[PDB]
Amino acid sequence: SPNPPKLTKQMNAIIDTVINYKDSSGRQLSEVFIQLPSRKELPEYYELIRKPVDFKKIKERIRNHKYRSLGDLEKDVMLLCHNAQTFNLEGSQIYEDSIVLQSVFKSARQKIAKEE
Ligand SMILES: O=C(/C=C/N1[C@H]2CC[C@@H]1c1ncnc(NC3CC3)c1C2)c1ccccc1O
Ligand SMILES: [Zn+2]
Ligand SMILES: [Zn+2]
């Protein structure tokens, strides 16, 4: 069945929490993840990463009712972070940031879906 308006709003709330999240230094960790470089700019990315995704795309998929559940949303966010861990050097800031955004997501999903 179609997504209730509340579900769509929870999804945007979760993702806005992730995007707007700032660490204890005030850096918005999501910045580099918003939009992938194009296939022309970084063909190496697409050679490696089978299922590219960025936060622009996730926002698109919320808007267009493509996630059937908050579990589907989570899967796409875990994919984004997995792709970042796959492409970027272990221990780089981008790798480390992706780990944190996993947690931020799981925290936000709980807070938003359980009311709290
Ligand atoms: O890994 C992601 C981004 C990667 N990079 C960003 C910053 C460092 C690295 C990079 N390496 C070389 N050329 C770079 N840019 C130049 C223009 C070619 C980029 C853009 C990513 C981004 C969004 C969602 C998921 C992701 O895995
Ligand atoms: Zn619609
Ligand atoms: Zn994998």
Strand partners, 22: 28
| CB contact at 8 A, 34 and 55 | yes
What is the C-alpha separation between 89 and 3, in angstroms, rounded?
Answer: 38
Method used to obtain the model? X-ray
Which residues are CB-contacts of 76 (< 8 A; sequence separation ≥ 6)?
53, 58, 61, 67
Q: How many CB atoms lie within 10 A of CB 83?
A: 21
What is the C-alpha separation between 70 and 8, in angstroms, rounded?
Answer: 9
Please indicate if the annotation marks 82 as binding a ligand: yes
Residue reference for tokens 């972070």: 81
Expressed in Å, this structure's resolution amounts to 1.7
| Most distant pair of Cα atoms in the chain: their distance | 44
- Ordered by start, the domain boundaries in the chain are 1-116
**Topology of 1-116 in CATH?**
Histone Acetyltransferase; Chain A (1.20.920)
Residue reference for tokens 């910045």: 31
In this structure, which residue's CA is closest to atom 1 in ligand 1?
84
- Dihedral in degrees, nearest 10, Cα atoms 44, 50, 55, 58: 160
What is the C-alpha separation between 58 and 12, in angstroms, rounded?
Answer: 10
In this structure, which residue's CA is closest to atom 26 in ligand 1?
84
The terminus-to-terminus CA distance of the chain in angstroms comes to: 26
